[PDB]
């Protein structure tokens, strides 16, 4: 299931980026 | 990732088609070989009857 090892990484990046923003958005105050 | 799409379909389409065809193609070869087994049974019966 390499198709999702790869989809996982894509979604992981999408959330990590959204999360980076969630954390920054809160961190920015 | 055009490759995930190429792979998701290549894995499925190339294999389901080639593989299921081998299943049924060989099933017929096997059935014919099973008929040979029946024909040997027939041959053995005929030799005994003669």
């Amino acid at each position: 299931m390499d198709a999702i090892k790869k989809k996982m990484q894509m979604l992981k990046l999408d959330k990590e980026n959204a999360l980076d923003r969630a954390e920054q958005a809160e961190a920015d105050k | 990732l055009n490759e995930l799409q190429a792979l998701i379909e290549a894995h499925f389409e190339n294999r389901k088609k080639e593989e299921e065809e081998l299943v049924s193609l060989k099933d017929r070869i096997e059935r014919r070989r099973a008929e040979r087994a029946e024909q040997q049974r027939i041959r053995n019966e005929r030799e005994k009857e003669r």
Binding site: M1, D2, A3, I4, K7 | I8, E9, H11, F12, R15, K16, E19, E20, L22, V23, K26, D27, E30, R33, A34, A37, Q40, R41, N44
Partner: protein
């Protein structure tokens, strides 16, 4: 020759029985290979078809 015949007949009968045992074992292998392929590629290849869907999303 009577003994050679009984022995050859034993061999012929042996071979008929051995062949019978192998007629059975060839059919068992013909059916086991069949069943294993029929269930194995049919299930695991199906599982790879399911991969096509399982790994979607």
């Amino acid at each position: 020759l009577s003994d050679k015949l009984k022995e050859a007949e034993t061999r012929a009968e042996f071979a008929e029985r051995s062949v019978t045992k192998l007629e059975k074992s060839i059919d068992d292998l013909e059916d086991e290979l069949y069943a294993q392929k029929l269930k194995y590629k049919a299930i695991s290849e199906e599982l790879d078809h399911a991969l096509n869907d399982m790994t979607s999303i």
